[PDB]
Protein backbone atom coordinates (compact mmCIF):
# COMPACT_ATOMS: atom_id res chain seq x y z
CA UNK A 1 0.00 0.00 0.00
CA UNK A 2 1.53 3.27 -1.20
CA UNK A 3 -0.83 6.27 -1.27
CA UNK A 4 -0.38 9.50 -3.26
CA UNK A 5 -2.21 12.85 -3.34
CA UNK A 6 -1.74 16.40 -4.64
CA UNK A 7 -3.44 19.83 -4.63
CA UNK A 8 -6.41 21.04 -6.65
CA UNK A 9 -7.92 23.80 -8.77
CA UNK A 10 -5.62 26.81 -9.19
CA UNK A 11 -6.25 29.25 -12.06
CA UNK A 12 -3.47 31.42 -13.54
CA UNK A 13 -2.81 33.88 -16.38
CA UNK A 14 -0.08 33.15 -18.99
CA UNK A 15 3.40 34.36 -18.06
CA UNK A 16 3.22 33.58 -14.35
CA UNK A 17 4.63 31.11 -11.83
CA UNK A 18 2.96 28.21 -10.00
CA UNK A 19 3.60 25.50 -7.42
CA UNK A 20 1.92 22.24 -6.38
CA UNK A 21 2.18 19.44 -3.83
CA UNK A 22 2.53 15.66 -3.92
CA UNK A 23 2.41 13.87 -0.57
CA UNK A 24 3.18 10.13 -0.37
CA UNK A 25 3.54 7.17 2.01
CA UNK A 26 4.30 3.45 2.22
CA UNK A 27 8.04 3.40 1.54
CA UNK A 28 11.43 4.86 2.43
CA UNK A 29 10.81 8.20 0.70
CA UNK A 30 14.51 8.79 0.00
CA UNK A 31 15.24 5.33 -1.44
CA UNK A 32 12.84 5.21 -4.41
CA UNK A 33 12.91 7.74 -7.27
CA UNK A 34 10.01 9.90 -8.49
CA UNK A 35 8.91 11.65 -11.70
CA UNK A 36 6.19 13.74 -13.37
CA UNK A 37 4.11 13.64 -16.57
CA UNK A 38 2.46 16.47 -18.54
CA UNK A 39 -0.42 14.35 -19.84
CA UNK A 40 -2.17 16.48 -22.48
CA UNK A 41 -5.75 15.97 -23.75
CA UNK A 42 -5.64 14.45 -27.23
CA UNK A 43 -1.87 14.79 -27.37
CA UNK A 44 0.81 12.31 -26.34
CA UNK A 45 1.59 11.84 -22.61
CA UNK A 46 4.68 14.04 -22.31
CA UNK A 47 7.32 13.16 -19.73
CA UNK A 48 8.70 16.04 -17.68
CA UNK A 49 11.61 14.61 -15.68
CA UNK A 50 12.62 12.54 -12.66
CA UNK A 51 13.97 13.25 -9.19
CA UNK A 52 16.07 11.35 -6.68
CA UNK A 53 14.68 12.38 -3.26
CA UNK A 54 17.77 11.45 -1.18
CA UNK A 55 20.18 14.08 -2.51
CA UNK A 56 17.69 15.96 -4.67
CA UNK A 57 19.34 14.90 -7.94
CA UNK A 58 17.16 15.66 -10.96
CA UNK A 59 16.78 15.42 -14.73
CA UNK A 60 14.68 17.60 -17.02
CA UNK A 61 13.35 17.47 -20.59
CA UNK A 62 14.44 20.21 -23.01
CA UNK A 63 10.98 21.67 -23.73
CA UNK A 64 10.45 22.09 -19.99
CA UNK A 65 14.05 22.92 -19.03
CA UNK A 66 14.53 26.27 -17.32
CA UNK A 67 10.78 26.53 -16.78
CA UNK A 68 10.28 23.46 -14.61
CA UNK A 69 11.64 23.17 -11.06
CA UNK A 70 11.26 19.86 -9.22
CA UNK A 71 11.78 19.96 -5.45
CA UNK A 72 11.06 17.98 -2.28
CA UNK A 73 11.05 17.90 1.52
CA UNK A 74 11.58 14.60 3.35
CA UNK A 75 10.46 16.28 6.59
CA UNK A 76 6.97 16.13 5.04
CA UNK A 77 7.33 13.40 2.38
CA UNK A 78 6.22 15.91 -0.23
CA UNK A 79 7.64 16.35 -3.74
CA UNK A 80 7.14 19.83 -5.18
CA UNK A 81 6.82 20.97 -8.79
CA UNK A 82 7.35 24.63 -9.69
CA UNK A 83 6.74 25.95 -13.21
CA UNK A 84 7.30 29.51 -14.44
CA UNK A 85 6.53 31.28 -17.74
CA UNK A 86 3.17 29.70 -18.50
CA UNK A 87 1.49 29.19 -21.88
CA UNK A 88 -1.51 27.49 -23.49
CA UNK A 89 0.80 24.60 -24.43
CA UNK A 90 1.21 23.66 -20.77
CA UNK A 91 -2.36 23.99 -19.48
CA UNK A 92 -3.10 20.28 -18.96
CA UNK A 93 -3.23 18.37 -15.65
CA UNK A 94 -0.03 16.96 -14.12
CA UNK A 95 0.60 13.67 -12.30
CA UNK A 96 3.45 12.55 -10.01
CA UNK A 97 4.36 8.84 -10.01
CA UNK A 98 6.94 6.28 -8.87
CA UNK A 99 8.09 2.96 -10.33
CA UNK A 100 6.96 -0.52 -9.30
CA UNK A 101 10.25 -1.00 -7.44
CA UNK A 102 13.35 1.06 -6.73
CA UNK A 103 15.22 -1.28 -9.06
CA UNK A 104 13.45 0.16 -12.12
CA UNK A 105 11.71 3.54 -12.25
CA UNK A 106 10.13 3.34 -15.72
CA UNK A 107 7.56 0.71 -14.70
CA UNK A 108 5.04 3.17 -13.24
CA UNK A 109 2.89 1.11 -10.88
CA UNK A 110 1.92 3.95 -8.53
CA UNK A 111 0.35 7.20 -9.76
CA UNK A 112 -0.98 10.46 -8.30
CA UNK A 113 -4.42 12.08 -7.99
CA UNK A 114 -6.40 14.65 -10.00
CA UNK A 115 -5.02 18.19 -10.05
CA UNK A 116 -7.13 20.67 -12.08
CA UNK A 117 -5.21 23.61 -13.56
CA UNK A 118 -6.72 26.47 -15.58
CA UNK A 119 -5.17 28.87 -18.11
Amino acid sequence: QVQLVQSGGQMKKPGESMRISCRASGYEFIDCTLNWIRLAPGKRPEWMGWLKPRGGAVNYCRPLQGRVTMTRDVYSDTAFLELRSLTVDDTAVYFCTRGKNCDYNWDFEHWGRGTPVIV
Partner: protein, 250 residues
Protein backbone atom coordinates in the same frame (compact mmCIF):
# COMPACT_ATOMS: atom_id res chain seq x y z
CA UNK B 1 41.75 -13.81 -3.04
CA UNK B 2 41.21 -13.69 0.71
CA UNK B 3 40.68 -9.93 0.79
CA UNK B 4 40.29 -7.24 -1.86
CA UNK B 5 42.77 -4.52 -2.74
CA UNK B 6 42.90 -1.49 -0.45
CA UNK B 7 39.61 0.37 -0.82
CA UNK B 8 39.99 3.96 0.38
CA UNK B 9 36.50 4.87 1.65
CA UNK B 10 36.73 8.47 0.44
CA UNK B 11 33.31 10.07 -0.04
CA UNK B 12 32.92 12.64 -2.81
CA UNK B 13 29.91 13.83 -4.77
CA UNK B 14 31.02 14.50 -8.34
CA UNK B 15 34.58 13.40 -9.08
CA UNK B 16 36.22 10.17 -7.92
CA UNK B 17 39.34 10.81 -5.85
CA UNK B 18 42.37 8.69 -4.95
CA UNK B 19 40.81 5.54 -6.39
CA UNK B 20 42.25 3.06 -8.88
CA UNK B 21 43.02 4.02 -12.48
CA UNK B 22 42.10 2.08 -15.61
CA UNK B 23 44.73 -0.34 -16.93
CA UNK B 24 44.62 -0.11 -20.73
CA UNK B 25 42.37 2.74 -21.80
CA UNK B 26 39.68 4.68 -19.91
CA UNK B 27 36.37 2.87 -19.49
CA UNK B 28 32.72 3.77 -19.04
CA UNK B 29 30.26 1.70 -17.02
CA UNK B 30 26.47 1.81 -16.75
CA UNK B 31 23.68 -0.66 -16.04
CA UNK B 32 21.78 0.47 -19.15
CA UNK B 33 22.60 3.62 -21.06
CA UNK B 34 19.03 4.03 -22.32
CA UNK B 35 18.08 4.04 -18.67
CA UNK B 36 18.73 7.78 -18.37
CA UNK B 37 17.97 7.31 -14.68
CA UNK B 38 21.21 5.35 -14.24
CA UNK B 39 24.66 6.62 -13.23
CA UNK B 40 27.49 6.48 -15.76
CA UNK B 41 30.75 5.66 -13.98
CA UNK B 42 34.05 6.62 -15.60
CA UNK B 43 37.48 5.35 -14.62
CA UNK B 44 40.53 7.31 -15.73
CA UNK B 45 43.74 5.78 -17.04
CA UNK B 46 45.80 8.80 -16.07
CA UNK B 47 44.93 10.38 -12.73
CA UNK B 48 44.69 14.16 -12.80
CA UNK B 49 46.09 15.72 -9.62
CA UNK B 50 43.89 18.40 -8.04
CA UNK B 51 45.37 20.75 -5.43
CA UNK B 52 43.00 22.46 -2.96
CA UNK B 53 43.09 24.77 0.09
CA UNK B 54 41.37 26.82 2.80
CA UNK B 55 43.84 29.75 2.82
CA UNK B 56 42.74 31.15 6.20
CA UNK B 57 44.99 30.68 9.27
CA UNK B 58 42.35 30.08 11.95
CA UNK B 59 42.52 30.16 15.77
CA UNK B 60 40.77 27.62 17.99
CA UNK B 61 38.46 28.89 20.73
CA UNK B 62 37.04 26.50 23.31
CA UNK B 63 33.76 27.76 24.72
CA UNK B 64 32.83 25.40 27.54
CA UNK B 65 29.14 24.59 27.63
CA UNK B 66 30.19 21.95 30.12
CA UNK B 67 30.21 20.25 32.48
CA UNK B 68 33.10 18.13 31.17
CA UNK B 69 32.80 19.26 27.54
CA UNK B 70 33.37 22.30 25.31
CA UNK B 71 32.34 23.59 21.88
CA UNK B 72 35.28 24.60 19.71
CA UNK B 73 35.10 27.41 17.16
CA UNK B 74 37.31 29.83 15.24
CA UNK B 75 38.35 32.55 17.67
CA UNK B 76 39.84 34.70 14.92
CA UNK B 77 41.60 34.76 11.54
CA UNK B 78 45.34 35.41 11.61
CA UNK B 79 45.97 37.44 8.47
CA UNK B 80 44.09 38.07 5.25
CA UNK B 81 40.58 36.80 4.61
CA UNK B 82 40.41 34.60 1.54
CA UNK B 83 38.38 32.09 -0.45
CA UNK B 84 38.74 28.31 -0.57
CA UNK B 85 39.38 26.73 -3.95
CA UNK B 86 40.77 23.83 -5.98
CA UNK B 87 43.43 24.01 -8.67
CA UNK B 88 43.68 21.62 -11.61
CA UNK B 89 45.48 21.86 -14.96
CA UNK B 90 42.84 22.64 -17.58
CA UNK B 91 45.11 21.00 -20.16
CA UNK B 92 45.26 17.78 -18.15
CA UNK B 93 41.54 18.00 -17.41
CA UNK B 94 40.33 18.62 -20.97
CA UNK B 95 42.84 16.24 -22.54
CA UNK B 96 41.28 13.83 -20.06
CA UNK B 97 37.88 14.87 -21.38
CA UNK B 98 39.24 13.76 -24.74
CA UNK B 99 39.84 10.28 -23.29
CA UNK B 100 36.26 10.20 -22.12
CA UNK B 101 34.36 11.38 -25.19
CA UNK B 102 35.94 8.80 -27.51
CA UNK B 103 34.91 6.00 -25.12
CA UNK B 104 31.59 7.76 -24.59
CA UNK B 105 31.03 7.75 -28.36
CA UNK B 106 31.49 3.99 -28.21
CA UNK B 107 28.42 3.47 -26.04
CA UNK B 108 26.58 6.15 -27.98
CA UNK B 109 26.51 6.99 -31.66
CA UNK B 110 29.34 9.02 -33.12
CA UNK B 111 26.98 11.96 -32.57
CA UNK B 112 28.69 14.96 -30.93
CA UNK B 113 28.59 15.24 -27.13
CA UNK B 114 28.06 18.07 -24.63
CA UNK B 115 28.76 18.53 -20.91
CA UNK B 116 26.83 20.67 -18.44
CA UNK B 117 26.40 21.80 -14.82
CA UNK B 118 24.10 19.81 -12.52
CA UNK B 119 20.37 20.37 -13.02
CA UNK B 120 19.65 20.57 -9.29
CA UNK B 121 19.79 19.12 -5.79
CA UNK B 122 21.40 19.74 -2.42
CA UNK B 123 24.79 21.49 -2.25
CA UNK B 124 26.14 17.99 -1.70
CA UNK B 125 25.14 16.86 -5.18
CA UNK B 126 25.18 20.11 -7.19
CA UNK B 127 28.75 20.81 -6.06
CA UNK B 128 31.97 18.84 -5.81
CA UNK B 129 31.98 18.03 -2.11
CA UNK B 130 34.83 16.38 -0.22
CA UNK B 131 36.96 16.53 2.92
CA UNK B 132 40.34 18.22 2.78
CA UNK B 133 42.37 18.06 5.97
CA UNK B 134 39.29 17.76 8.19
CA UNK B 135 37.11 20.46 6.63
CA UNK B 136 34.32 19.75 4.16
CA UNK B 137 34.46 21.49 0.78
CA UNK B 138 31.80 22.27 -1.82
CA UNK B 139 33.44 23.32 -5.09
CA UNK B 140 31.35 24.90 -7.83
CA UNK B 141 32.02 22.60 -10.78
CA UNK B 142 30.42 24.61 -13.60
CA UNK B 143 33.91 25.13 -15.03
CA UNK B 144 34.86 21.48 -15.45
CA UNK B 145 31.48 20.65 -16.98
CA UNK B 146 30.74 23.13 -19.73
CA UNK B 147 32.01 21.95 -23.10
CA UNK B 148 30.97 20.45 -26.45
CA UNK B 149 33.18 17.80 -28.06
CA UNK B 150 33.02 17.29 -31.83
CA UNK B 151 35.10 16.03 -34.72
CA UNK B 152 34.72 18.46 -37.63
CA UNK B 153 47.94 28.34 -21.35
CA UNK B 154 46.66 28.58 -17.77
CA UNK B 155 44.91 26.61 -14.99
CA UNK B 156 41.46 26.16 -13.41
CA UNK B 157 40.48 27.62 -10.01
CA UNK B 158 37.17 26.35 -8.63
CA UNK B 159 35.52 28.40 -5.89
CA UNK B 160 34.61 26.46 -2.75
CA UNK B 161 32.43 27.02 0.29
CA UNK B 162 33.17 25.45 3.67
CA UNK B 163 30.35 23.96 5.68
CA UNK B 164 30.73 22.74 9.25
CA UNK B 165 27.21 21.57 10.10
CA UNK B 166 26.77 18.68 7.71
CA UNK B 167 24.54 15.64 7.23
CA UNK B 168 26.18 12.77 5.35
CA UNK B 169 23.86 9.99 4.23
CA UNK B 170 20.93 12.35 4.85
CA UNK B 171 19.92 11.08 8.27
CA UNK B 172 16.84 11.57 10.44
CA UNK B 173 17.27 14.99 12.05
CA UNK B 174 20.85 13.96 12.74
CA UNK B 175 23.56 16.46 11.82
CA UNK B 176 27.28 16.71 12.55
CA UNK B 177 29.29 19.82 13.37
CA UNK B 178 32.90 19.52 12.30
CA UNK B 179 34.94 21.77 14.59
CA UNK B 180 37.28 24.11 12.73
CA UNK B 181 40.81 22.88 12.05
CA UNK B 182 43.56 25.13 13.40
CA UNK B 183 45.40 27.24 10.84
CA UNK B 184 45.21 26.75 7.08
CA UNK B 185 44.77 23.47 5.25
CA UNK B 186 46.01 22.33 1.84
CA UNK B 187 45.45 18.88 0.34
CA UNK B 188 46.01 17.17 -3.01
CA UNK B 189 43.67 14.59 -4.52
CA UNK B 190 43.91 12.42 -7.62
CA UNK B 191 40.81 12.44 -9.79
CA UNK B 192 40.49 8.78 -10.76
CA UNK B 193 37.07 8.98 -12.35
CA UNK B 194 33.66 10.59 -11.95
CA UNK B 195 29.89 10.14 -12.27
CA UNK B 196 27.64 11.39 -15.07
CA UNK B 197 23.88 11.59 -15.61
CA UNK B 198 22.28 11.76 -19.05
CA UNK B 199 19.33 13.97 -19.99
CA UNK B 200 16.70 11.58 -21.34
CA UNK B 201 14.93 13.78 -23.88
CA UNK B 202 17.01 13.58 -27.07
CA UNK B 203 16.93 16.73 -29.20
CA UNK B 204 17.64 17.73 -32.80
CA UNK B 205 20.46 20.08 -31.89
CA UNK B 206 20.99 18.44 -28.50
CA UNK B 207 22.74 16.28 -28.84
CA UNK B 208 23.28 14.27 -25.63
CA UNK B 209 23.90 15.99 -22.30
CA UNK B 210 25.90 14.64 -19.35
CA UNK B 211 25.97 16.44 -15.99
CA UNK B 212 27.76 15.45 -12.73
CA UNK B 213 25.67 12.81 -10.98
CA UNK B 214 26.09 11.79 -7.36
CA UNK B 215 22.76 11.51 -5.59
CA UNK B 216 23.36 8.03 -4.21
CA UNK B 217 26.48 6.84 -2.42
CA UNK B 218 26.38 3.17 -3.40
CA UNK B 219 28.30 3.92 -6.57
CA UNK B 220 31.38 5.20 -4.77
CA UNK B 221 31.84 1.61 -3.66
CA UNK B 222 30.76 0.04 -6.96
CA UNK B 223 33.49 2.09 -8.65
CA UNK B 224 36.05 0.02 -6.76
CA UNK B 225 34.21 -3.16 -5.71
CA UNK B 226 33.26 -3.91 -9.33
CA UNK B 227 36.31 -6.13 -9.70
CA UNK B 228 35.12 -8.56 -7.03
CA UNK B 229 32.32 -10.98 -6.09
CA UNK B 230 31.56 -13.32 -3.19
CA UNK B 231 30.79 -17.06 -3.37
CA UNK B 232 30.04 -19.89 -0.92
CA UNK B 233 32.18 -23.01 -1.05
CA UNK B 234 30.43 -26.40 -1.08
CA UNK B 235 33.17 -29.07 -0.58
CA UNK B 236 30.83 -32.07 -0.49
CA UNK B 237 29.98 -33.80 -3.78
CA UNK B 238 28.70 -37.21 -4.85
CA UNK B 239 29.85 -39.04 -7.98
CA UNK B 240 29.66 -42.59 -9.43
CA UNK B 241 32.74 -44.75 -9.69
CA UNK B 242 32.75 -48.54 -9.74
CA UNK B 243 33.30 -49.35 -6.09
CA UNK B 244 30.95 -50.90 -3.54
CA UNK B 245 31.01 -50.46 0.23
CA UNK B 246 33.02 -53.65 0.83
CA UNK B 247 30.29 -55.71 2.50
CA UNK B 248 30.42 -58.92 0.47
CA UNK B 249 31.53 -60.39 3.80
CA UNK B 250 31.02 -59.38 7.43
Amino acid sequence: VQCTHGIRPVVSTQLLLNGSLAEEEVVIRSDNFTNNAKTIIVQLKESVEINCTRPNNNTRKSIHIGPGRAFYTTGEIIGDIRQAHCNISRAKWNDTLKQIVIKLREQFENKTIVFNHSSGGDPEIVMHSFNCGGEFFYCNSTQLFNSTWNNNGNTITLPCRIKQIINMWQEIGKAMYAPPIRGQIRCSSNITGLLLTRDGCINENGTEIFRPGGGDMRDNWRSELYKYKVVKIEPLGVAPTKCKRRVVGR
